[PDB]
């Protein structure tokens with residue numbers, strides 16, 4: 001059943017699906033420690049097709065595949081591929097799908113993963129499509145939260161920053177729909193969460209409050225998920241200069257924060273999280289990075305139908 | 308011996324008496340948990356005569372009586388009684404005392420409880436007389452302190468706010484006379500503790516320092532008992548506007564406070580304690596409210612001669 | 615081998631020597647607790663020759679000698695000795711050395727201890743020579759650090775204040791040469807550590823960074839060793855007025871400090887460490903004073919050849 005499934009939008013997953021990925025992720029995590037080399041993916045090839053920059057998503061996926069015993073092909077720069085000669089996206093996928101058993105694609109255009117999944121008879125995983133979705137990030141974010149707070153429900157989660165272009169929070173907000181939590185969306189009014197998404201989450205009954213001042217909600221938050229201003233998604237630099245550096249987390253802001261407050265960030269960060277926060281017990285973004293491998297290993301194995 | 312005793316001024320109690328009430332209070336507290344319904348007061352009626360507003364003192368006393376198995380009569384508004392037709396206080400008590408086995412009275416005039424106790428052959432408990440005394444508050448405050456710090460002596464207690472009109476701190480300061488503690492009275496010079504009381508406490512040998520700046524003493528305090536400015540006791544509003552909002556406890560003030568510092572407040576609070584303090588480990592005012600029932604249950608049982 | 619050795623410069627000790635003193639110091643410490651009176655120094659006399667003021671170094675040494683079972687002679691003020699008649703230092707030592715079995719000298723001129731050790735056939739211990747060295751302070755500082763952090767290496771130590779005239783940090787920096795630590799020298803540019811010393815420490819491979827702003831390094835420090843501005847060493851008061859009160863440690867500065875950060879100070883302190891820091895878990899300067907006796911007891915016993 002998991003074999004052949006795509007991972008395009010977090011909205012295509014139920015609470016059971018997410019739960020399964022996270023439980024399976026823990027499985028492979030421990031399993032790795034024991035064997036130090038798994039073989040579920042022996043004879044399988046993962047093609048990582050990145051049309052925009054990535055450090056974590058590409059490297060953790062390729063890392064996961066090797067830990068699973070598979071092989072990896074792909075490109076990190078579209079300029080080196082034949083898209084350079086003018087080839088289209090659907091032609092690229094139709095050709096590359098014949099070389100691998102699973103595709104992971106990051107593209108600057110929203111809906112690129114859906115288009116790829118449509119014309120591929122190989123499972124397609126969305127590593128980020130424009131400012132739309134980022135399903136595997138959400139899945140590793142939820143893994144981290146459950147791992148850190150031991151449990152899902154009963155949490156007050158705050159999403160800060162560029163909620164408008166941040167594909168990470170678009171998916172993360174949608175996934176939280178299956179959990180009993182109070183969501184707080186803190187951001188400049190120019191970078192608010194897509195109305196439709198905030199609408200839907202309340203169309204299902206979730207306490208969602210949109211605010212501009214962080215200190216208003218800081219004190220009751222269990223989770224503070226910080227984001228980066230997606231400079232590369234703005235219409236032009238002027239549109240970005242108008243919201244530049246207009247939020248940041250540091251020791252001062254953390255004065256009115258609960259002792260158990262945990263701060264996350266999909267990364268990379270520019271300056272929205274002062275490095276002084278790093279040494280604090282609050283910071284968990286680098287532990288967040290770590291969980292990406294077992295979560296991505298679970299996804300690869302599941303979708304390749306090897307576990 | 309306890310049967311028939313009144314509870315007018317905390318000065319009418321020895322260290323033994325206070326200790327007994329607190330030990331007995333713990334007894335009934337645990338006992339309640341077990342039986343979930345006691346009967347010491349079966350066939351006894353408590354008359355709560357409140358001539359001014361109350362939430363905690365009236366409700367906790369009535370609550371205590373029911374937990375003890377007794378019945379309750381009384382009025383929360385004098386306007387609904389025959390004092391409306393012009394009846395005096397002593398006539399009110401002489402008549403009502405024939406209907407109950409114990410009276411709890413809160414009146415806006417100092418000495419009202421003494422006058423009531425004088426003309427009643429039923430035990431009379433002072434729930435607050437003007438800006439004079441508040442014995443059961445002090446008794447539940449001491450219960451809370453011993454309960455929180457495990458013990459009485461060796462503490463540095465700071466009383467902040469309206470020490471002039473605050474009947475709660477007038478009694479609380481007097482009771483502390485039996486304990487080895489350093490008292491700090493922080494308040495505007497217009498709202499200082501009644502000279503006589505501060506005099507007496509030092510006439511017995513207690514280190515009592517009166518200051519205007521809280522931060523001067525904040526760092527060495529074990530207990531910080533905050534009070535509300537008694538607006539309704541001032542000569543007129545102008546007299547109150549001159550000391551309005553001139554003290555408050557929040558996270559900033561708590562920067563220079565000991566980790567074990569515990570903050571109390573007889574309540575209600577207007578703005579003298581910022582709600583951000585609520586989530587902190589320092590706040591114990593709502594735990595303070597809780598202890599009022601077993602303390603008041605102990606007092607009712609003792610004075611009714613049923614334990 | 616230890617018998618007859620002098621203690622002039624911390625540079626005359628190897629890592630083995632320092633380690634031995636500290637282990638031996640722990641020995642005598644526990645031993646004292648048991649017997650409550652030792653006799654290693656029975657029949658031995660310590661002469662404390664102080665030509666400048668001292669509270670800790672003189673008193674802890676005399677204290678140590680008595681705990682060891684020895685006797686003490688000496689002067690705290692040179693004005694009362696025959697140096698008053700014009701006697702020289704070498705004549706003073708040559709004469710006094712005939713009366714005791716060990717000398718402890720504090721003098722305002724750099725090299726005074728070396729001169730004393732040269733013309734004495736009795737062990738000479740430098741309790742401070744001008745702004746040059748202070749070996750027993752360093753030895754008790756290292757004892758405190760190992761005692762507090764359980765271990766030596768892997769620490770980030772910050773030395774703040776008057777590093778120019780502070781004989782305490784001149785020796786302390788030199789001793790740290792044998793340990794794997796990152797040293798941070800924070801001080802006004804007018805009070806920087808003697809170039810030669812900072813040079814040498816890096817000539818051996820130690821990460822040594824000299825800065826003016828404390829907050830730059832505060833966050834990563836394990837140890838913060840504060841010093842006093844050596845007013846009495848300045849050319850004149852004007853030279854001292856130019857660097858007066860230009861550093862201090864208080865709760866504000868400690869906002870960006872690690873929870874395990876430990877603050878030390880050889881003492882006395884004027885105002886460079888706000889007394890509010892005292893109650894904090896960071897302060898250990900008075901525990902630092904305590905360790906001086908067993909460290910000095912170890913030194914006396916070792917050098918007198920009685921252990």
Ligand SMILES: O=C(O)C[C@H](NC(=O)CP(=O)(O)O)C(=O)O
Pocket residue numbers: 053054055056057058128134137166167168227228266267268
């Ligand atoms: O780039 C961001 O700000 C968040 C997010 N980041 C990641 O997925 C991590 P990376 O770009 O290193 O793979 C994304 O949307 O690509």
Ligand SMILES: O=C(O)C[C@H](NC(=O)CP(=O)(O)O)C(=O)O
Pocket residue numbers: 360361362363364365435441444473474475534535573574575
């Ligand atoms: O009203 C105050 O500020 C303190 C004190 N408060 C109480 O006893 C609680 P309550 O008025 O709710 O019974 C009082 O003097 O009545």
Ligand SMILES: O=C(O)C[C@H](NC(=O)CP(=O)(O)O)C(=O)O
Pocket residue numbers: 667668669670671672742748751780781782841842880881882
């Ligand atoms: O005086 C100082 O600031 C540090 C140091 N202090 C001590 O040794 C302690 P004392 O002067 O009390 O013996 C010194 O150099 O003499």
